[PDB]
Structure formats: C-alpha cells, structure tokens
Amino acid sequence: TLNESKFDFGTMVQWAYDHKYAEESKIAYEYALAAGSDSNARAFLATNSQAKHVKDCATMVRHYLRAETQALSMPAYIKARCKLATGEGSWKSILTFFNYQNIELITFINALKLWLKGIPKKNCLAFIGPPNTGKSMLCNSLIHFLGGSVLSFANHKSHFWLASLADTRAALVDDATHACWRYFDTYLRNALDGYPVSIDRKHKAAVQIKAPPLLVTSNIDVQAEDRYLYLHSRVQTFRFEQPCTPFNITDADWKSFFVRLWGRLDLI
Amino acid sequence: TLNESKFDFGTMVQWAYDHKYAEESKIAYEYALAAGSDSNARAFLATNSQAKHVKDCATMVRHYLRAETQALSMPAYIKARCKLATGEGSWKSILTFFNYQNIELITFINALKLWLKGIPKKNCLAFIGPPNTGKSMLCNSLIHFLGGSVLSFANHKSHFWLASLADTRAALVDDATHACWRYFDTYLRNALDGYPVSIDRKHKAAVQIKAPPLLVTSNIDVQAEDRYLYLHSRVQTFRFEQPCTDEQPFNITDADWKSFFVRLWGRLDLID
Amino acid sequence: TLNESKFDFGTMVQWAYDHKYAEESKIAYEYALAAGSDSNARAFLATNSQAKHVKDCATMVRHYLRAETQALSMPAYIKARCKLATGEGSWKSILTFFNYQNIELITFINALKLWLKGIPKKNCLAFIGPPNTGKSMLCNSLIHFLGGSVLSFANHKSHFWLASLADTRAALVDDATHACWRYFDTYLRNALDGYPVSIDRKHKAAVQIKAPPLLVTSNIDVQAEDRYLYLHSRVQTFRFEQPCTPFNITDADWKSFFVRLWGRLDLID
Amino acid sequence: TLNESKFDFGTMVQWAYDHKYAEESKIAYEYALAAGSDSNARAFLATNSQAKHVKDCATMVRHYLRAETQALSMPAYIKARCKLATGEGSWKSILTFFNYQNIELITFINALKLWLKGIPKKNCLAFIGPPNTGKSMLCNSLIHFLGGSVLSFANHKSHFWLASLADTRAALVDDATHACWRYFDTYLRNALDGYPVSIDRKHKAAVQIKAPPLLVTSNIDVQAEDRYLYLHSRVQTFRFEQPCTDEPFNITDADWKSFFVRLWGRLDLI
Amino acid sequence: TLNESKFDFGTMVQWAYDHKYAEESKIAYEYALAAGSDSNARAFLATNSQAKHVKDCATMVRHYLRAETQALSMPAYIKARCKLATGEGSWKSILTFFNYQNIELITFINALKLWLKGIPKKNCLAFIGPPNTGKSMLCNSLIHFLGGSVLSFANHKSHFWLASLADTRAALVDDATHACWRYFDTYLRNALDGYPVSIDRKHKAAVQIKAPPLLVTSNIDVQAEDRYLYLHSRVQTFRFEQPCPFNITDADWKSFFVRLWGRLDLI
Amino acid sequence: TLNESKFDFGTMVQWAYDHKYAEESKIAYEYALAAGSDSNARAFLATNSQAKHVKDCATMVRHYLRAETQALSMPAYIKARCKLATGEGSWKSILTFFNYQNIELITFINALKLWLKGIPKKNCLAFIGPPNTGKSMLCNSLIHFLGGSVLSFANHKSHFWLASLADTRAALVDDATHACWRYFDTYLRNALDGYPVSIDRKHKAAVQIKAPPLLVTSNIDVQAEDRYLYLHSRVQTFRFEQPCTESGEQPFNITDADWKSFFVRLWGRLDLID
Ligand SMILES: [Mg+2]
Ligand SMILES: [Mg+2]
Ligand SMILES: [Mg+2]
C-alpha cells in the first residue's frame, strides 16, 4: 500500500456513496488505493487533515444512505432489494422448507403481508422450536435479503443497542433467551407492537420513530408461557419442530419469493 | 444523488427551517438535491466541512422549532396540530370507541379539558385494563395527533430519559408496569401537581420546566392499589375492559382527532 | 422568522443577560428576531458559527446569572425572589392555613428566621401529619418562591440524590420515608450541625459544602421515635393534623408574607 | 454587569490565581466586573472566545493550586495554613478541651507529630466516643485549619469517593459506622501502613499515591473489637466522654494557629 | 531520547504502516527516534500539534490494517500468516500432541476445516479438561499464528469488550468459568454460531458483522452439562485428559497448514 | 508563583521527559517555575492555550515513557532499574529475611527466575501468612525497585482498574481478601498465567498485551482452600509465619539498594544473561 506522495471533499463523498462504502476504515483504505489513478485520492493523501475527512465522509455517506432508505415505502424498498440480489433462486426453496416444517406457505404469506406493513400487534414474527430446526437459518436469510439489522441483546446494558432501529426497515433478535424475553416484556412492548419509540443515537439527537418489523428466533415458546402473557397478543409464532442439518435459502430465493408473491403479499 | 462539482450557513438554516427539516439525514440529502437550482446548496457541496454544517443546521433548526412551540399557548398549539392533520376522518370513531368500552364521551371530554390546561392532579390520564382493549392505540393516536413524545422506561436508569419533557407539549408512557408506577410515586410527584421539576440532558444544560400533560396505558389499576395511594387523586383512570381481538384492527387517526377537536373546541374550554 | 441576510459576541451576551435568557433555543430564536433593528443580531446570522455562538452565549449567561446569585446575602437573595414573583398576593392566605392546622404564626416566623440563617440545629424544619394535610402544598410553595430544589430519596438507587444541594439556597425532602430518616440519622448529622459534606455529582467532581436549609415532609414523627434520638434536637417539627379537601399558597402570597414580616424575620440588610 | 464596551491569557490566569478563584462561573463573573478598571479584563469581553478562556483559566488555576499544595513539605504547608489563619484565638482553647475530655496533651502532641509525617501505623487518628462529646467539633476544626477534606462514607458505593486522597494533605472520615471500619479493614490496609494505593479520579486515569494523614470520628471503638484486629496496631484512638450541650466549645482557626506556632518545636516541624 | 530539535502527515503514516506500528505510544516514541536521520521525523518534533498527529496516525494505520485484513479470503489470509511465521517447525509437533491426548489428527482437521469457513453451529471449538493438559497452550499458539485476538471476560461489564470481533479473523476466550459460559449462553449464542452480530466500537458507531471463528479453553465440559443444553449443538468439544512443558511454535502451524492445505479446502 | 508575562511544544516535552514529569499538574506548575530562567517557559505563560499544551505534554510524555519501558527486555529493564537505585545495600538483608521466615533463598531464586520470564502458570507469586509477617513489606519493596504498579481491588467495579497492566513490567495486589481471590478465580485466570489479555484503558483504545508478572500478598492460603482449586496450579505460595515487629521496632526493611545488590549478585542464576 501507498499512503504517501487541491482536495475536494464532495468527490470523495461521491466516490464513497457510489461504492456504498459507509465505514471509516474501508473508506480510508479503499480511497488510498484509488490514489494511483485518481488525482483527488492523491490530493487526499497530501492533506494533513485526512483523518477528519475520512470521518466526515463516513458521516456524510451514512446521512445519504439513511435518508434514501427512509424515503422509500416498503414496496419500493423491497423492489430495490430484489434488484440487488443475484444468483440462481426459487421460492420453492422457501416453500419446501415450510412444508418440511409442516406449515402451509399461505400461513406465512398472510403473516408476512401484515408484518411488512408494520401493523400494530402484528409487527413481530417469532420462529420457535428445539435446536437445529432452521430458525436462525431462515430469519437470517430474510434479514440479509432485506438489508435488515441484527440486534445484539448482549449490548442491552448500553443506551444505543437499539440505535439501528432508527435506520433499518426490518430487525432480528437471534436466540432470545429468558433474560431476553423478559427485557422485551418489561421495556419494549411498544417496540414489538411497532409503535413510535425514542431511539438514542451516538453523535445525533434522539429520534422518535416507528419501531420497524421484528423477527425473533428462540427455543422458548412465549405463547405457551403464562409469565409471558402480555407478549401472546403481539407475537405471531411459527413452530419449527423438524430437524434439518443442507436446507439453505439464498437471496435469489427471496427475490423469486417476492416477485412471485408480489400481488399476494399486497405490495401495490 | 450528486454531492460534488462562498457558502452562507444562515441561508441553509433558513431553507431547512422553512421546509421544517430537523434531522441531519434529511437536511444533508435534501439540500444536496437542491444543488441544481439553489447555488448556496452548490457552495455547501464544495466545502470540506459539509458534515459540521449539517450537524449545526439540525441544531439551529430544532432550536427555533422548540422555541416557537414553547411560545404558543395550548389553544394556539392544538390549532397548528389540526392545521397539520390530513386525510378523511371523524370524531364519531372516538365516540364509537369509548361507547364500545361503555364510557360516555363526555366523561373523557371533561377530563381532557382539565388535562390540556395541565391543572394540578388532573395532569395525568390513564387507560387501564387487560391486554387488547385499545389502550395503546387510543393513546398513541392522540399523542401522534398532538405531536407529543413517547417516553421509554427502558432508558429510565439514566434520568436523560425525561429529556423530551423539556421540549414536547404532551407525553406518553406506553404500558406502565409496577416498576414504572413506583417510579411516578417517588419522582414524578411534582409533575402531577403543577410545581416545576428539573429535567437533565446528555448535552448538559439542566433546566427546570412545568411538566407536560401525561398519558399512561397500563394493565395495572392504580386506584385499586394502596402501594400507589398518592397517585389515586392525581391520576384520572379510564377502564377499558372490552377486547378487539378480531384484518386491520380498529384505528383512530389524525383526522379523527382533527374533527374531534374542531367539533368539541368549545366544550373543551379552548376558547381565546 | 428570518434566519438569513462584524459580529461581537459580548454584545449578544450583554443582550441575553439583559433579557435573562439562559436558553440556547430561546437565545437563538429571540436574537434572530431582534435583527431587522440590531446591527449585531444581523451580523450573527451572517456568521457560519452561529450554533457555537448560541451555545457559548448560554454558558456565558448561566455563568453570570449563577455567579451573581451565589454572591448575594440571604436577605438580598429573598429581595430578589420578591422582585421575581408577581401576582394576586396576600399573606392572609398563609396565616389562615396555619390557623387551620392549629400552628401559631409566631412559632413559624421564628423558626423560619433561624432557618434562613442556617444556624445548626435550626437548619431543618419537618412538617408532619397523616396523608393529605397540605404538607407538600405548603413546602413546595415556599421552596418554589425561594427557588430551592426538591429531593426524593428513593432507596439505594438514590446515590446522587443530594446532588442539587451543591448549588441551591434551600431544599426540600419530599415525603421522607423511614429509611430517609435513618439516612439523616446515619450520614447527615454534620450537614445539620453546620459542618462540610462531600456531595457527589454525575459527570463532574464532588464538592464539599455547608448544607443549605432543609424542609422535610413526612408521615413519620421523628420527635416521637426514640430510634432517631439524635435528630430530636436538630429537627423542628410542625404537626399538620387537618385534612384539606381548597387552600393554595402562591409566589405572590410568599412575597407579601416576606415583605410584611421582613423586620420580624431579621432580614435587615 | 456591563459586558460590552489584545487579550493575554496569562494576565487573566494570574488574576484568578491571586484571588484563588478556581470555578468558571466565579472566574467569568468576577473578571467581568474587574473590566471597569482593567485593560485585559476589558479586552476579554471584546473576545469572541470568552467561554473558552474562562474554561481554560479554571483548568489553569486548578492545575496550579493543586500542584503547589502537593509541592510543599508538611512544615512549609502548615506554615502556609498559619498565614491564612485570621482572627485571634489561643492554643489554650484547645488545651482546655482536652483537659475537659480527660486526655493528655502530651499523648496528642506525639500522635499528631507522627500523624503529620504520615509514619506507617501512625497515619490514622480515631476520635471515639458517644454522641455529643465534641468529636466532630474538634476534628472538623483541625481539618479546616489544615485545608483538609471530608470524605463521606455515604458515597462509598462509587469507588470515586476517595478521589480527594490524591489531593489533600489531611483527610477526615466523619462518623464511621461498622460498615465503614470494615471497609477500611477490607480495602485500605495500605493507606494505614503507608504503602501505595491506586486512587481513581473521575475524568482522568487513576494515580498511585501514599494516602495522606487520616482522621476518623465514630461511636465505635476499634481497639475493643475483635473483628478489627488488623486495625488495632494501625489506628491511634482517643476517647471523649464529656457532654457539649447548651441551647460551650468552638475551636477556631486562630486557636490552631496559636497551637502550632507554640508547639512547633514539640511537633518536630523544624 | 530527544524530543525537540515542513511536516507531511502521509509520510508518517506510510512509515507507521510499513513498520506495522498501530499504537499511539509506540508510534510517537519510535518516530521521535527516526528523527536523527529523517527530516520528516525532525519536522514532526517542530510542530505544536504533534499530539494530534500521533493520534491521527494511529487512527489511520488501524483503518488500513483492519481494511486489508477484512479484504482477504480465509485462504489468502492464512497464506499471509504463513509468510509471516519463521523458525524451525513441523506439523508433527501438532500430530504428536493430539496423539498424546488420544485424539486422531483427522478429527481435528475435519473440525478445523469447517471452523475456518465459519459455518453456522460449527464456528466454535472448545478445548476442555482438567488443569495442565495443554489447552491454553495449544489454543494460544494457534491464535498467535493466526493473529487472532484474546477476549477478556473480565471486561464483560463494558460495552466494548467484544470490539475486537469487528477486526480479527479468529478469537479466543481462555479459561471459561461457569460465569463465562452463562454469559455466552444468555447473550451470545448467535456470536458463537458465527451469525452477523452488532459490535459496539469505542468512539465509532456500532458495526453489524459476521462473528469470527471462536476458540475456548475450559475445565467445564459443556457437552456433559444439562444446564448448558443450548450450547451443545454450537460447540465442538475436544477433551484433553493427559497432563504435562511441551510447546507449539508458529513454524509448526506454518508446516501444518502448508502440508494440509488441500485437505483443509483452502483452494 | 508568577503565571503571567514564541513557544515550542517539543522543548516543553523534552523538558518534561528529562525530568520524568508525566502528570499534568506537576508539568504545568513545575514548568511555570522554570519560567524565571527559561524563555520557552516564559512563552508558555504568554499563550492562550497553555491548558492544552499541558494536556498534550502529559500525553506525549506518557507515550514516550510507556514506549521505552515496553521496548526493553526483562534483563535490560532490570539493568536500568539497578542503575536507578541508590544507597547502602546488601542482598544479605533479603537472605536474612527469607531465612527468618524459614525459607531457603534458592527456593525464591528458582521461583523468581521463572516469574521474571513470565512463564505460563508461573507468572504469579503469592506471599501468604498471618498479619505482620512482612508480606506487604517485601512485595512493595520489590515492586518499588522494579517500578511496577499496585492494583487496588477497591476499584474493581471499574473497567479501567487493570489499566496499568498495559504499562508496567511487574504488578502487585496487596492484601487479597476472599472477594479478591474469587474475582481472580472467575475473571482473571489467564492474566495470572501471564497469557495475552485485552486491557481496557480509559480514554484510549483497549490494548492486547502479555499480562505482566504478578505479586499477591494475602492472609488467605489459596493452596489449602478447595474452593480456589483452579488457582492452585497458577500460584506459587510463600508462607511467611514469623512476626516482623513487639510494636517496639520493625527490624526488617528492604531498600532499593538491597535489590540492586540482589540482582547484581544473582544475575547469572536468574538467567538474565545475553
Ligand atoms: Mg438459532
Ligand atoms: Mg399495550
Ligand atoms: Mg488454561
């Protein structure tokens, strides 16, 4: 690598935006590479304030990306996500899986249609069963397709562990333990309902925002438990009982899924 | 988007304020687009300190907006909130819902009249019942119409969670648990009395303001419990016992409140 | 509002000080208005670092205002609280309330006189009686008039609860629970006796100071309970027996009270 | 407080130091008043970066006061505190009290002597007795004269409650409870033996220091208690039994000044 | 050292990067030394802003270093790690040791092949047994060879104790006590699984990132414990029963990977 | 003082480094004193950003001091520590003491030789016995000589209470209570082993570093206790049974010069050679 040797900020931002580079380290490094055949990248390594520029660039790209994502309605967004996916794919992969778990695909379609609209008390789908039934498998593939974020309950003692909810269009909590379910029960009923919530962000002001659609995987059946009574109404449960690993849903599978079931998932 | 090829900050703030953009994300993006015509927006994209300008702009805007909003009387405010509410709607759906819960709309009206003026011991309305009775949905629709804020007891361990009581004209604590009621019982006593309290910040300023009218929803009946005796006379309870467990469930909207308020403006002592 | 179009900061601060604006948002807004008729306010809107100037102006103002009030004598401070409070006012309001709860006015005037002077053992007046006898009512009204602060002792979690004491001329402990009294009994004798106490604050250094005068409200009669023997000589109880559900004390009432009884409260400056 | 109509920071810091103002709001307000008859104070209000200077200034003065207090030997330090002592009392006021509490001046003078040097196991003087025997009275008067600091065991749940030990030359832990004494036993053995303790400070990294001289008051006799065996050889105790109660004793700063000026020899402060 | 005496930042960074100096103190000091025979190092000591240059340099180097590590495939990465190792070595050292613990090397090769790919439920290998059975010994040597990071559960009450997971290609938790296993069970199943995980960085904002392969050493057999039921499926256990001290070097691992390249599916 | 009245930062740092002043208040005050006969110190008092320069100076010094301490090997480091010690001394002071505690000096030498190399499971020496047996006495004198740091278990609820491990070459925990041993057992086995650990530092970034050699003094005998089973293999215990005081005198007191004598004499057997 070379980092040695008039700089325009905007151009670097343009570049960063185009390549979807949102991360300070990647932006810095990847631009320093562009330096061999880019006079602006060359100029960037000539400035003594490159550190700040990398920082401001990431801020700037984050601003734009966030703003784009927020502007789109769910259909237009899924549309963009479909455009993004590549590879061989079939909704039949998804069908087969649900059929393997002895679930009619329509049951999922119905729930998914409403989940996507973020309708109160329907804003949370939970995939529940004994280990190795493709729960994490499925939810992760979908969250990936959608460009959703994973929430890490491991960081719940922090104020900003929910900060991504100010940006993403769907979110996942993977392997909700009893501690996890209780926290949700106590503090995050409104977020599970998909009502507005005050979201704390690092260098920014708090935003009040509709908590986006939620996914949860767990071994714990909330509907069956009396002590999670108040969650019964806001959580739709899909029970995955059958063992699997082979079964492997790609992005292209979801692309196929949404394209096939566009009308049937009500996406006007 | 295009973010490339002297700047005046005040001009950007003017634009942002007029368009009422107070989020950096939006200010950043939207101004970048306005670069084709408006050539201050063009100057903006040629500065190496774009990021700061966005930051500062959001600050500057939300300063002004907060400041006009405090300057308004509750009447004049609700007015702006009606002016802001769009779509087709009717107060009948509010009537329908209370009557559904076997409550006369006039019981609600009375309470609301006093609650809007923030009268001592009338400052907090609670909607209490078993799960699925329209508590959250009623309150949220109101708070939404009112432009109020939703406090999250999740962050309660840091007093900073009440920061927004400094800014907004009404607040909701959605789904109060015992823990949360106990919190009211020790701290927010003064809020339920009209005597000012001290609100803190991450950007530490440490002001003192009269507390905005509160809404609470809860599965816990406070009037029924002695460990919450103080709150009995200071919290007005509306018991919702009828469930709505059966495509889109029932929904109150901005327009529904808009008409509710235009129709009942008189009876609500909002006259000026 | 107009926010568009050489700037002198001190001038802005001067202005802000004059209008008593300590409020970033208010400052920002009000200056931008007073601007088609102030060369400096206009100049402010020309500057790119407006956001900084507002922040600094606030800081600067809250410094001056804070420091100017910290420097007053107790009498001078009350004279300030008197100027600051306006409205429909009579002390007759208070006198009848005391008469309703069967407390002689002079008992209270005296006690207050010595309380405002923060003499040890005279430093803490408790108001005691069963729920709903206007204890909060009265104390809040007084502390408000005086611009003091309100403290709630929760339990353990209340670690920083005394943090405001670092700063106010007076304070009120709202509904002292039994544990709150034990806290006094255990950790606060020095405060009551006129000695320095370390007061922990959030994200700044602890401070050592003489405890401001304290009002307390409680259902617990510390004079009666021998397990608080040590507070008996340090706390002066006013017993409120009569339930009230009309009475309402105001900033304007206290004003009249203080102006009327000025000579009798020994505030002679 | 007129604020309107080339600034040297030095001149300001100086002014703040001279007047021993360490606290921003005071510094700001007080300098603004000086501006009537002070060119640099006048130049200050002409600056756009006033807030920055007021901050810096506080930080600057805080640095100096803190570091000069640390730099002086215990005798020179006491010497300084004698110069600060205003009014006029007498060392006799102090002697009279000890006479009343039936304790030996000589015992005290020695204890204090060694306590002042912070000699291992001589570093902590307990003042023990039932309530209202003038324990707080005497200890606080001594701390005051000394420029000491009070530690509140109330704040012990934060470990920052000891922060001031990285600063004072003498410290008082008032009204020790059992909780507190076994705290000492548990955590502070090194403070008593004159070995190093890591004292955590809030906004900056912890420092290792030798704990300055310590006073304690308490209703609890550590020497008479078995669970504090370690403490017996490290804590020098004095029992006060005598009431101090009229709706009579008030040791002043001048009292202490006279005490030290007069027993200077006997305290080994040469 | 000498600290007194036109500065170019980029050259300093270049330098720091070349020497792989990533931390402020080292950078500052080591550069101040270069000052005798480097005009840019000389010019650095002439600036009144050297403090922030050292700071920014560190920032800039970790940007680059992180970015170049993240860019490499696991094969390409191990390749570079092999290039880095020096000295005398043999995979036999490793074979001998697994054989000593009565474990066929192929069992380990199979597990490692998958672990390196970060396959779900296969992302975590645990070395388990009574004290002094070369558990920490082996895991540490591997983590060293790989340039992986240590996690310190001692800091688990902080938000940033997992912050290295945003940078390393492999991680180790050494001596998981019961408290440690429980924390993992409660909060980090997905991390163990090697699914995407939101990782809180100190002054930057969080990143969503796939969790690197994991090594744990412990006296606690999770597989045998009913209360760690939910960990059974995501943790492959290697039981080290035999005591010992013997040592595995970088060059041993270099030998190991080179020899077993194809058998490890490193194309 | 006089705090009043062009500046070169490097020179102030040079100064601060030379005087090994690393701590902001000392740096500011001490330099303000140098102002009488130093034009750079005089210029410092003329700038408006003194507060910052003091701040940056401390940063810079800390950088240099840490960096130079980490660069040295253990031998070269002890070497520099010997150079630093002054006064009358003899290793016999040390011998006499161990002999007084009925311990052969060679037992300690053997342990120390390995402890200094920071060999796994040998990275921690605990001195254990009833009160007043010179445990803290000895450990502190050694830590002092080595320029090691003391960890204070009073601060253990903070992330940063271990922050010194990123800097010192030896470290001591004095008077380990039961709470203390348990914390070590639960959270800190591998640091007791002297394996790489992630040490969190306050304002800066966490650092991954080899945990330095450890000393512990305690009234609690971990080897005898079944509940500290897993500490048995990583802690070498020296039992001090004999009193080191009556509260007349205190006969045993090891100086820096005693250790200087100790290491110089026993350089070979501690394998601190080429
Ligand atoms: Mg799973
Ligand atoms: Mg609800
Ligand atoms: Mg191990």
Numbering used by the authors:
A (entry chain B): 301 to 305, 310 to 549, 556 to 578
B (entry chain A): 301 to 305, 310 to 550, 554 to 579
C (entry chain F): 301 to 305, 310 to 549, 556 to 579
D (entry chain E): 301 to 305, 310 to 551, 556 to 578
E (entry chain C): 301 to 305, 310 to 548, 556 to 578
F (entry chain D): 301 to 305, 310 to 549, 551 to 579
The authors write:
The C-terminal half (residues ∼301–605, the E1 helicase domain—E1HD) has helicase activity and can be sub-divided into the oligomerization domain (OD, residues ∼308–378) and the AAA+ adenosine triphosphatase (ATPase) domain that includes a flexible C-terminal acidic tail (AT, residues 579–605) required for helicase processivity.
The E1FL hexamer structure, determined at a resolution of 18 Å, has a maximum diameter of 130 Å and a height of 100 Å and can accommodate ∼410 kDa of protein mass, in agreement with the predicted 409 kDa. The shape of the complex resembles a triple-tiered ring, with the middle ring having the larger diameter and the upper ring the smallest (left). There is a central tunnel (‘a’) that varies in diameter along its length: at the bottom of the structure (C-terminus) the tunnel is ∼20 Å in diameter; travelling upwards the tunnel ‘a’ forms a chamber within the HD area, which expands to 27 Å below sub-domain 3 (middle) and then it narrows to 23 Å in diameter at the entrance to the central tunnel formed by the upper ring. Notably, the data indicate that dsDNA enters the E1 complex through a tight side tunnel and not along the central axis of the hexamer as commonly assumed for E1 and other hexameric helicases, while the 5′ ‘passive’ strand exits the complex via a channel opposite the dsDNA entry tunnel. DNA unwinding is therefore taking place at the entrance to the helicase domain, inside and not outside the hexamer. Our observations therefore suggest a revision of the steric exclusion model proposed for E1 (20) where, alternatively, DNA strands are wedged apart within the hexameric assembly and not outside.
